Amino acid sequence: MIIQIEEYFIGMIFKGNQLVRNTIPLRREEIFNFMDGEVVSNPEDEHLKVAEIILKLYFAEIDDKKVRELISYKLEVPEFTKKVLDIVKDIEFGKTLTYGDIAKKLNTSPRAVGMALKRNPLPLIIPCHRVVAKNSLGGYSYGLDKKKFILERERLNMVSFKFNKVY
């Protein structure tokens, strides 16, 4: 479950063929003491292949839907997350709005939706970035610097399909 790469310790944990929680960046190099049993996750293939994938969508360079290699997530929600998830299904790299318009879109409010995408079990897939506060930027657990970079990166570098017209 625990794995160090580049400058982040990814906590990928699943119940088999379905994800549940896989996140966390760098912090304590000796964090290996916070788990007397794991400290592996089988770095061989299963980890390298996924690692590059995760970092891929991160630096806006995954292309396509991407909703697959990230493994299907199940359960895990901080008071709410289903509604917000419905948001990703629509918004992609290019949209940006707050919680108000989102929550109101389903049947709730930006208050409950806040804690939702906030402690989302899978931040590297959920459009929490495209959900700022009234003013600008609104995060507590990881973000700001990254959310800033990813916010500008997405807008920049527009990837378009190939012009293949066969009449």
Contact in structure between 77 and 119 (CB atoms under 8 Å)? no
Q: Clarify whether residues 2 and 54 are in a common domain.
A: yes
Residue 100 and residue 33 in one domain: no
The set of residues, in sequence order, having a beta carbon less than 8 Å from that of 40 and lying 6+ positions away, is 2
Residues 144 and 123 in one domain: yes
Assign residue 12 the CATH number of its domain.
Answer: 3.30.160.460
Experimental determination approach used: NMR
Q: Tell me how far the alpha carbon of residue 90 is from its chain's centroid.
A: 15
Distance CA 114, CA 99 (A): 7
Q: Which residues are catalytic?
A: 128
Q: What is the CATH number of the domain that holds 122?
A: 1.10.10.10
Closest CA to 103 of 124, 81, 136: 81
Does 60 share its domain with 83? no
Based on the domain organization, do 107 and 150 belong to the same domain?
A: yes
Give domain status of residue 166, yes or no.
no
Which helix or strand (DSSP H or E) is residue 152 part of? helix 145-155
- Please check whether residue 12 is in contact with residue 41, taking contact to mean a CB–CB distance below 8 angstroms: yes
- Based on the domain organization, do 93 and 144 belong to the same domain? yes
Residue 164 lies in a domain: no
The contacts of residue 81 (CB under 8 Å, 6+ apart) are: 116, 117, 120, 121
Q: How many domains does the chain fold into?
A: 2
Evaluate whether 10 touches 23 at the Cβ level (below 8 Å). yes
CA angle in degrees (0–180, nearest 5) for 158-162-167: 140
Phi and psi for 130 in degrees, rounded to 5?
-80, 30
- Answer whether residue 102 is part of any domain: yes
Q: Is residue 117 included in any domain, yes or no? A: yes
Which residues are CB-neighbours of 54 under 8 A, at least 6 positions away?
A: 10, 70, 124
130-166 burial, b for 16+ CB within 10 Å, e for fewer?
A: bbbeeeeebbeebbeeebeebbeebeeeeeeeeeeee
Q: Which of 112, 126, 121, 118 lies closest to 79, judged by CA?
A: 112
Residue ranges making up the domain that contains 117: 77-157
**Can you list the positions of beta strands (E) in 25-74?**
none
